[PDB]
């Protein structure tokens, strides 16, 4: 019956090594509802929601040959909340890594993904409260217990990727999570701007043309 307030926090650029990391953090009384990342060239290893000093933080990983990455936290005032992270490691021999909120009453607010390999491989091409990532990547689900909290998924896909793809939440909903659907080649990153989910792409033409899809997690109370 309350209002859900969310804001975007960008970390400082990480630096150019494989071990160079970027951390985006929320204020002590805010909740980290999602974690995304951005790199001007691509050449990234995704991101993960990690526990640091009792609170959850958004950590971004750089790839070998990458100039650095930005960690992008979505920070929200969610009253009476209990948020946890559920991780599924990669299954390289599968059609994609899957994870969902295990506790009854748990609501999915965001999906993060990170990989250990230098870049993501090729393959032959969602459920309630479920995150789906690349077969070679670890998938991280942000799962929250909050009274009256309801979340829904909205998608927008364009064949010609260009500069960006956007998907916006409807009026009355708050954008809590922003990401790109997996298998979409040439993704620079994703980030929330108000109630709009922005997915940036490297504009590389088709080589079966594909569709770069912006995936939004929209939440409300009551």
């Amino acid at each position: 019956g309350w209002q859900l307030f969310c804001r975007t926090v960008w970390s400082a650029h990480s630096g150019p090594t494989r071990m160079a990391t970027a951390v985006a953090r929320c204020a002590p009384d805010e909740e980290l509802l999602s974690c995304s990342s951005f790199s001007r060239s691509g050449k990234r290893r995704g991101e993960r929601m990690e526990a640091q000093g009792g609170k959850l933080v958004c950590r971004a990983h750089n790839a070998f040959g990458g100039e650095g990455v930005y960690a992008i936290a979505r920070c929200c005032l969610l009253p009476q909340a209990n948020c946890s992270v559920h991780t599924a490691p990669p299954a390289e021999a599968s059609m994609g890594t899957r994870v969902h909120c295990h506790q009854q009453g748990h609501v999915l607010t965001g999906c993060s993904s990170h990989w250990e390999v230098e870049d993501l491989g090729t393959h032959k091409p969602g459920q309630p409260n479920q995150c789906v990532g690349h077969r070679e990547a670890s998938i991280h689900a942000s799962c929250c217990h909050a009274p009256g909290l309801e979340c829904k998924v909205k998608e927008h896909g364009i064949p010609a990727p260009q500069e960006q793809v956007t998907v916006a939440c409807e009026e009355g909903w708050t954008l809590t999570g922003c990401s790109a659907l997996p298998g979409t080649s040439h993704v620079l990153g994703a980030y929330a701007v108000d109630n709009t989910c922005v997915v940036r792409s490297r504009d590389v033409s088709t080589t079966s043309e594909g569709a770069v899809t912006a995936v939004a997690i929209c939440c409300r109370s009551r």
């Epitope: 307030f5 804001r7 204020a27 002590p28 009384d29 805010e30 920070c75 005032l77």
Partner: nanobody
Amino acid sequence: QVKLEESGGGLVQAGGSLRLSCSPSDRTFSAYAMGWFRQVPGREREFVATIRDSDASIYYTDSVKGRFTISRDNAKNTVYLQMNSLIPDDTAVYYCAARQYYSGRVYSTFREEYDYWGQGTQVTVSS
């Protein structure tokens, strides 16, 4: 009825320093909290810094910690944003924000938490 007036900004080179100032037209208006937000085009107005009445009330976004300093002068009724070792990523339109009344939160970090805003001052950090 209160309009916040911003001073400073413009072009400055990487590694350089700049001081932004902000004061209301009516100097008898004392805000409980003063803040700085910045907007990169295509992105939301993001939180930079906040201050109330003490050093314990000061809070910065991680990306500006150790480089930027927020201070308040009651006698001049002005809030300052001293920006040192400026990096190309500091390029944005910087906005002053004022929250008139008390907040139960230790730090006011959301746009929605503020009432009055500055016009916005462009900061461009060369090469």
